[PDB]
Amino acid sequence: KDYIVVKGAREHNLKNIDVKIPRDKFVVITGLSGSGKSSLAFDTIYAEGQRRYVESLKPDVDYIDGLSPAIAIDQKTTSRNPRSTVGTVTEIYDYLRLLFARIGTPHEEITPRMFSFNNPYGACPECTGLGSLMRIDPMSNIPCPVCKGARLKKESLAVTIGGKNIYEVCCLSIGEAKEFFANLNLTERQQLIARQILKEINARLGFLVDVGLDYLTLARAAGTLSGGEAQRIRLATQIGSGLMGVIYILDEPSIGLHQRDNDRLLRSLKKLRDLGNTLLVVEHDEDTMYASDYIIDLGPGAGSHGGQIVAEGTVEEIKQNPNSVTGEYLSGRKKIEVPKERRKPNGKWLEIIGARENNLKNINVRIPLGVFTCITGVSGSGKSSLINEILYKRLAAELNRASVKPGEHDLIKGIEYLDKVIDIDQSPIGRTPRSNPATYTGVFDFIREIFANTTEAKTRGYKAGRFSFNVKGGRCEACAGDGINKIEMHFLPDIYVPCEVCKGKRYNRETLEVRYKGKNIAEVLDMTVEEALEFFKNIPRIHKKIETLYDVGLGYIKLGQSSTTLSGGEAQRVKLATELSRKSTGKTMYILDEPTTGLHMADVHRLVGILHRLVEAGNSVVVIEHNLDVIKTADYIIDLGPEGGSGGGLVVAEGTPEEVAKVENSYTGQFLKKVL
Template structure:
């Protein structure tokens, strides 16, 4: 192989070739140290679950989780001691099998004399920790306190800790008693983009379908490049080129395709939950109907910060001034004229129930629910934001300050507010990223509501709490990279668990076996998903 060909190898294949290399005695002496270094670095990449990546892969095409794990592999190779490492959700995008390898890498770094601080919601990572700091008790303005700290065993004993209650299984996300049956199937024929091996994949309709794979096995290629872009081409006549495939059968059944990802709901300070969900329009109409506003001739447009009239012109309704920094990120400072309210003095003089428009935008969803209790159109949209677990966010909170998980749930709330017509295909890529057990439980409820309205939800996910609640699983594998791209198993979680070749089935077996044992022992779940002897779970509780 020349250097260009070798660079196109995956980490796994490159390591295999290096280890099987046969050299003469003299060449062995010359290359010994170089080969040792190459092997160790390839093994580091393999151990953090990146064996499927090609060595020549462009850095711009890597996901956030992949980039973080490459940096982690670099640190492992440096063999430094006395270092404090901080990792933010390193398990993002990892199958439970690959997560084991990542934990072993973290242990090896710890054992060198380093300290590893991990922000994580993954159960296996928490159970493997030496010490846990649990923040809460809820999110946003209701959080910011240390609820519990100690070893996993100590956290599990603490009944005030929501995390401890889930780890100890006093609370849990219940496995559905019945699985929905698919109404029909889309069928992808001959998908062979990237590492997909010209596979035919059935996509069940009218159910919650989960695509599970070991890392790098082609999940995003199949769901995003082939399914989403392929349907968009047929339904919307999109000009975007889909991944290589022969056909998609029964696509005429689908009316709409919506991909709900964790990208921001807006990239400017003016974008916020109220404007994105359509909530701001009726709020502005309410203010325009106030007697003082009518006397002054103010229309709903007066209360918009996107057009001239009622907004502060010094910051053009942003509430902040952007200061461009050469070679550094831009800095935002509060506008001195409006003090961050976004509006001019005349607009702020108009009050509804004693609050002006800026004060209303500063309300949390929970506060606004009480404030607008008598206005059904506003209350309905606020209820949906509250139901997806976002009661703590501010109506006018800048989109740039929202996390990926929060942005995704705002998009879900917007979809729930639409008239239910059915026959819509929703696609979500790892929606549980950054979510605590309680938030995941709330998310599953929302996804089930979309399915119950006659829609189809396809989720790419590794979180076993979501996988066990699926009606149908598409398991790809068996490995990542060139060793993947095949269908390993199809069917309900119970059918996947019976498949000995499936890594997903291996982890599902333990979960389903535990449920069966509890049922046989007469331990039935209570309405909160926990055991009968557990205390009542507060629906609004969460940690972050």
């Protein structure tokens, strides 16, 4: 029917909830980090919709009614193939080659297959159409000397329209290519025989421009792209294809996108929906809520304290609902307050000389030390390059002795003012089931000593290393401390089940005999942080670490959770807590690349508090954030622009946000003037 009825969903931490999502409408799922929105969407609806279609050619839900095939558009990147480019992915190269073979004037007969690099007819004989000959320097990729990177035969390059061949057309940026195709002149016969192709090309280019990627080049390889750029390219391609009756699931479509493009992105999403589809956008932006037809709010907390549908309905009912977390922040009951007094530089600056990496226009920038510094700018302005490829790499090479090649820069002044450089990202903190937050924070070494300092341990002569599931002697011998066994089937992939010897306790019978304060090591490792905070009140050495973990918002997690199952936000919060627990020497540099990726308003407030605490501790924090709430609390803002692509790479404004708001020709300043 016209509803996606889900009854009896218990995936992950869902508390047996029932929902009725309307069909063919814009639906936004909102909740705190780890509340369960991501599980409820991806693991249930996307999984069921994909399985029910692939099986034609296993969620813990009871039954779902009215499920169309589901396509997931998330921030995922793959190496792909060298044959794939931006134009190939967007399916505009086919129309380009059709137009070239139809109305192309040469400078056998011209054929559409003659312009393709995926067929032997038009592919360059030397590089086989790849465009680059990868040779291992006595594998460094070098341009093909024959085709000069065009990846086509020399004969096919004679066909030109408007004075430009196919490679020159494909090398232009999307916006200027659309402008060139718009004002092109053709006779009556050419217009009659190439109306459909021109209309399709114009429509696809307009969709790509409206999405936000008006600076990309069609000749750029699809492999070398960011997550946001790839996701936006996929959204534009899906709009162009025009599939009907398909449920689309989006994970934070506004990630890595400036505030000025939000209206265009919302219009693009509405246009995609209007052709007979449904959207399940999982977004936390304030502007996105007001453009939706149905909001589903989970909570009220996270982990074991959430998973229930707190509120449902339109934005007005969400605001009027008192127990909804999202409505409290939307209505203005709780909000982030702009600081009254801002820190000032002490006279120590980091100046980068001759930064010309990628599209940077050989500029010099000064970064204050000891203050919270934010970097803004339009999409594709070169801020990410300028930070990651130059400053972080040079600092790592100078301090940590890391052998990573920096970008195209001359030198940097002020290296002696820092002692170490630390990068915090959503990368997982572990790849094996042998690490948990308890060991990463370092509190496990204290808990082991506390356990070994008991009367029974001294009586039995147990050492500090006995109570650890990583050495021989204390762990379970049957499962080798992993807690699971390997069972192989005849025609099925190997399955993993809990070990029968220890029942998943990870320790042998002898170890479990000891008990401190009525609990053994398994009970300690199988309790949440909010309980270990009260349990370890007497001991301050572990109390400090537990309180630090609780401060970053990890009061719902348990010390025994494997690092493999941790999400990006959990890993980032664990790293932040670990850095908080350390001893600040006043010479530490923290670099964060958009830390607000997938955080609610309350999580943003907590992260702002933690960042201010870290700055006040005596160190310096530099972040690249597009969120105005984080931006307005900064102490020094560097703006890059004034546009994206070849037009950008310069510096528009610098200084405190109050000074930046006074700059007329700056989008960030214009937005800051209104928000303040």
